[PDB]
Swiss-Prot record, chain A:
Belongs to the glutamate-gated ion channel (TC 1.A.10.1) family. NR1/GRIN1 subfamily. This is Glutamate receptor ionotropic, NMDA 1. NMDA is probably regulated by C-terminal phosphorylation of an isoform of GRIN1 by PKC. Its phosphorylated state is influenced by the formation of the NMDAR-PPP2CB complex and the NMDAR channel activity. Component of N-methyl-D-aspartate (NMDA) receptors (NMDARs) that function as heterotetrameric, ligand-gated cation channels with high calcium permeability and voltage-dependent block by Mg(2+). NMDARs participate in synaptic plasticity for learning and memory formation by contributing to the long-term potentiation (LTP). Channel activation requires binding of the neurotransmitter L-glutamate to the GluN2 subunit, glycine or D-serine binding to the GluN1 subunit, plus membrane depolarization to eliminate channel inhibition by Mg(2+).
Swiss-Prot record, chain B:
Heterotetramer; the NMDAR subunits are modular and harbor tiered domains that function in concert to regulate opening and closing of the cation-selective ion channel pore. Forms heterotetrameric channels composed of two GluN1/zeta subunits (GRIN1), and two identical GluN2/epsilon subunits (GRIN2A, GRIN2B, GRIN2C or GRIN2D) or GluN3 subunits (GRIN3A or GRIN3B) (in vitro). Can also form heterotetrameric channels that contain at least two GluN1 subunits and at least two different GluN2 subunits (or a combination of one GluN2 and one GluN3 subunits) (in vitro). This is Glutamate receptor ionotropic, NMDA 1. Glycans are attached at residues 22, 42. Belongs to the glutamate-gated ion channel (TC 1.A.10.1) family. NR1/GRIN1 subfamily. Component of N-methyl-D-aspartate (NMDA) receptors (NMDARs) that function as heterotetrameric, ligand-gated cation channels with high calcium permeability and voltage-dependent block by Mg(2+). NMDARs participate in synaptic plasticity for learning and memory formation by contributing to the long-term potentiation (LTP). Channel activation requires binding of the neurotransmitter L-glutamate to the GluN2 subunit, glycine or D-serine binding to the GluN1 subunit, plus membrane depolarization to eliminate channel inhibition by Mg(2+). It is linked to Neurodevelopmental disorder with or without hyperkinetic movements and seizures, autosomal dominant: An autosomal dominant neurodevelopmental disorder characterized by severe intellectual disability and developmental delay, absent speech, muscular hypotonia, dyskinesia, and hyperkinetic movements. Cortical blindness, cerebral atrophy, and seizures are present in some patients. It comes from Homo sapiens (Human). The chain holds residues 450 to 499 of 938 of the full protein.
UniProtKB/Swiss-Prot annotation, chain C:
Heterotetramer. Forms heterotetrameric channels composed of two GluN1/zeta subunits (GRIN1), and two identical GluN2/epsilon subunits (GRIN2A, GRIN2B, GRIN2C or GRIN2D) or GluN3 subunits (GRIN3A or GRIN3B) (in vitro). Can also form heterotetrameric channels that contain at least two GluN1 subunits and at least two different GluN2 subunits (or a combination of one GluN2 and one GluN3 subunits) (in vitro). In vivo, the subunit composition may depend on the expression levels of the different subunits. Found in a complex with GRIN1, GRIN3A and PPP2CB. Found in a complex with GRIN1 and GRIN3B. Belongs to the glutamate-gated ion channel (TC 1.A.10.1) family. NR2A/GRIN2A subfamily. Changing residue 150 to I: In FESD; uncertain significance; also found in a cutaneous malignant melanoma sample; somatic mutation; no effect on function in ion transmembrane transport when expressed in Xenopus oocytes; has no effect on channel basal gating properties and activation by glutamate and glycine. It comes from the Eukaryota. Component of N-methyl-D-aspartate (NMDA) receptors (NMDARs) that function as heterotetrameric, ligand-gated cation channels with high calcium permeability and voltage-dependent block by Mg(2+). NMDARs participate in synaptic plasticity for learning and memory formation by contributing to the slow phase of excitatory postsynaptic current, long-term synaptic potentiation, and learning. Residues 1-461 are extracellular. This is Glutamate receptor ionotropic, NMDA 2A. Changing residue 110 to I: Found in a patient with autism spectrum disorder; uncertain significance. Contains an N-terminal domain, a ligand-binding domain and a transmembrane domain. Agonist binding to the extracellular ligand-binding domains triggers channel gating. The chain holds residues 34 to 495 of 1464 of the full protein.
Amino acid sequence: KIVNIGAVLSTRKHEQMFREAVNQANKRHGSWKIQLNATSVTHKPNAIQMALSVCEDLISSQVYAILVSHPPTPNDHFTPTPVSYTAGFYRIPVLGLTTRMSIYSDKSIHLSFLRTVPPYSHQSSVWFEMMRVYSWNHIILLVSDDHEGRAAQKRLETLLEERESKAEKVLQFDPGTKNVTALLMEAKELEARVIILSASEDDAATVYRAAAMLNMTGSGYVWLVGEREISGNALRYAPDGILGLQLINGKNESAHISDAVGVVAQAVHELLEKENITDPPRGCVGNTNIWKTGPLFKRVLMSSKYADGVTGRVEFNEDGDRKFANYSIMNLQNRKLVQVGIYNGTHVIPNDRKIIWPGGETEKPRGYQMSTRLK
Amino acid sequence: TVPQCCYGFCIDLLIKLARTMNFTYEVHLVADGKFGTQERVNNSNKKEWN
Amino acid sequence: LNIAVMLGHSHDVTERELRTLWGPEQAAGLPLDVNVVALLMNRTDPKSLITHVCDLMSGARIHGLVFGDDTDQEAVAQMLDFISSHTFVPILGIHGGASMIMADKDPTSTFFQFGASIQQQATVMLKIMQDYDWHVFSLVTTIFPGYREFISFVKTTVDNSFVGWDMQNVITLDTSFEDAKTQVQLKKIHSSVILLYCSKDEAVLILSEARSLGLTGYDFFWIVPSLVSGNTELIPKEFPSGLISVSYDDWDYSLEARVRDGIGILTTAASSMLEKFSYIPEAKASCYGQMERPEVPMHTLHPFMVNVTWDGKDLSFTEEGYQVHPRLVVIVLNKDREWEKVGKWENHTLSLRHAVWPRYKSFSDEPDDNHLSIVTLEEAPFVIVEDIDPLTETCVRNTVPCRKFVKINNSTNEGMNVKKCCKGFCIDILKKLSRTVKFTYDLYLVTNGKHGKKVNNVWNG
Amino acid sequence: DMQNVITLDTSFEDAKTQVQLKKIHSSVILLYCSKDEAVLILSEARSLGL
C-alpha cells in the first residue's frame, strides 16, 4: 500500500511541502494506513549522474512517480532529460511540474511523461483565439527550426486549415541567425505585418535590432511572441506595445505541489481500486521487467479528473497538459508590461488597458495593404 | 531576358481592368513557354506543379 | 583501438575471442591495436549499464562499440543516448533493443543501429503491395505514438505514387479492451490484404477478434513487420499462414559475420580519422565528472561514418544512421506457423522473392476453394497478351498478368511461369464474371497443343 | 429492393446478433419481434447507429 513518490527540486523545504501534502493526501478523502512514505532528492550537480538517487534510492524504495522542476538553476541545458529517460525504461509515470520544452511532449519517446504546465505550442492555439479577436487573414509565421518549433507548426497549420485560414509565410531560422536581413527583406514583400515570433532570446533581440534597422516596426507590425523571447535581451531590443504571453500560475510551484499531491493521491486510490497491481521492482539489476500497469498508470492518470486544483481544474489534455489554464497577455509599453488578454483557457477577456499597436496607435491595424502591381 | 513587344486579347482586357480596377501589371515571358504540370522531381516521387 | 561488446547470453565469449582474432587476422591488419571487451548478459538494467559504462570508461577509455543482444526492450537503445552523449562514442546496434530503432537520432547521439529504418520499412511494404499487385488495401494501426509516423508514411508515399494505390483507410484501434468500439471499427474493413502496425498482444486481440469477424479468411492477406513478429523464434498461437514480417535477422546472417563487418566499419572510419586527423578523441576520463566540456576537438565519426564499404557491401549509413543498402530479411509464416524467408532487399533495395502469391492456406481453417485454373490460347482480340512495362509497377489499366511457361532451352524446357499483362474480349468477360459469378480466376497460357488433338484421343491444348 | 430477413436466432447472443446486425445496410428497417427483443434491438442499433 505504501506508495513512494519522488520529488526532484532545488530545495528541501518544498520537498517538505510534498511531505506535508502527503500528510494531507493521507487525510483528504484518501484511505490507507501507511499508503505513502516520502521520497525526495534535489536536482543533482552532475546531469550525467541522475540515476544514482533513482535506481539506488528511489526505485530501490519502489518509487511509483517523481515530480520534477526544471533544474536547480532551471536555465542551462539542464532541462531534465536524464532522470526522465531513466524513468523511461519500464513505463514509470512522471509529471513534469513546470516544463514547457515540448521536446518532452514527444510521446513516441516520452512515454510516461505528462505535464502540469502546457508548453509553448499550446500557445499556438491561443493566437488563433486572437485571430478571431482581431480578424486576421495575412499571416507571418516565424519559426526557429526546432522540434518544438515544428510541432508548434503542426498545431498552427492544423488550427489554421481546420478553419481554412491560410498562412502567407513561415520563415525558418536557426538560432544564432543574425543575417535574417535577407529573410527580413522577404518580409518587406507583404500585405501582412502580423509578425508571429518563435525563437530564443538572442535570435529575437538581433532581429529586433535588424528589423527596427530595416525600419520594419511601425503600427501594423504586430509582434506575436513566444516566451523564450520574453526573457533576456529579447526584452531589451523589442519595441513597445508588444503582445507577450503569460500562463497564470505558471510559477506558483507551491500550488503545483498541492495540486500534484492531491491528483496523485487520489490516482493512487484509483490504482488500489484496480486489480492485479503489479509490483515495482526494487533493483535496477536483474529486473528486466516493464510495468504491466505502466499503461494502466497512464489510463489512471488520463481518466482521472481533478477540478480541485489550486491552479484551477487540474484536468489535462490528451497530451497530458492541463486544460483551461488561465492566460494573461501583456504589452511592453515603454517596456512596461500592460496586461490586456485573459483567458479561462478560451474565454476572451481583454483588459480595459488599450493595446498601443507596437509602433503607432491603439487602432486595430491591417496586414492587408494592396500593391496594385500584378506579376 | 529581353523585354519584348506583346500583342493580344488579354492586353486589351488588362487595360480594361486598369480602367475599371486601377491596377498595374507586371508582364513577363515564360522561361518554359509551358503551363507546367505536377511532375515528379528526382527521388522520383516529388509531384510538383511546374 | 578498442571496441566494447555486451550481449544477450548467446554464442560464447571464447567464441568471441576467436571472432576477434579472426577479424584481426582477416584483412587490413590494424595499425590501431584494436582491442575488444566482450561479454554475454541478460539485463535491460540501468545499474548494469552504469557498471559497464563506468568500468569500461575507466578501463582504458574503450573506443568502439558493437552490440547485439537477446532482448527486445526498445527504449534501452534510446537509453544508449546517454552513452552516445556522455561518452560520445559511436554505438552499433545489431540485435536486442539495440536493433530495435525507435530512437529518432539526435545531434548529440552517436547511434548507428542496423535495424528499424522505418522509411526503408515503408518502401519495402509498398513494393510488397507492388510485386503481387496488391493495390487494394485495408490499413490498421493502433495509436502508439510513432504509428502516426507510419500514417504519414502511407499518406505521403501513396500521394507521391502515380500508381493509384487503392485505399482503405488506417482504422486505428484507440485503446485496447474497448472490444465493442474495436469491432465497430473492425466491421469497417472490407478488403483482402490487411496491413498491421500494433503490438504483439494487440495482435492476439485482433486475430482473436478477426477470427470472429472472419477477416482471417484464407483469401485475405496479412503483412505484419518485425514490430509484432520481433523474434521469429517467438511464434504465438493465433498466428496463421501467410503472416509476413521484414527483419534484419540472423536467418540470413550470423552474429559474428555482422560483427566482423561492423568492426571493420569502425576501423575504416578510424582510418578516415587517421587520414583527416592523425588522432582520435578518446573516451572521457570518468562517468560522474563534468571535466572541461564535451568539446570533441578530434571530432567523432559522424563525418567519418559517411563513407564506409566492406567487402562489396556499401556498409555506409544514412545521416540518420540507417543502412544505405539494407538487408531486410523478409520472412513469412506458413501453414505450420513457420517463419520462412521470401524477400531480400540488398540490391538497390529491390525485392528478391519466390513469386508465390497464394499462401493463405488453411492454418486456422476458412478453407478457400475459389481459384479457377484458366489456361487459354493467345486469341486476339479475345486474348491479347502484353508484357510487364516498367510503368512504376506491373500494372496496365486493363491487364491481368498471366503466368506463361517460358522454357529455358530447347533442352532444359523448364517452362518458367512468367506473369504477363493481359487484355482482350474474354478477359473483359472474366472481369464481368468476377462481377457476376465473382471468383478468382487463375490465368495461364497453353503450350502443349492448341485446342486439342485426337492423338489417339489424348487431348492436347 | 431486398435486404434479406436477418433473423435474430436466440436472444442474448449479443455478439452473433451484432455480427448479423452489421449486415443491415439501408434506411427502412422492418421488424417482427417481441417487445423486449425490440428493447434489445433499439439498444443495439443505437450502438450501431442504425
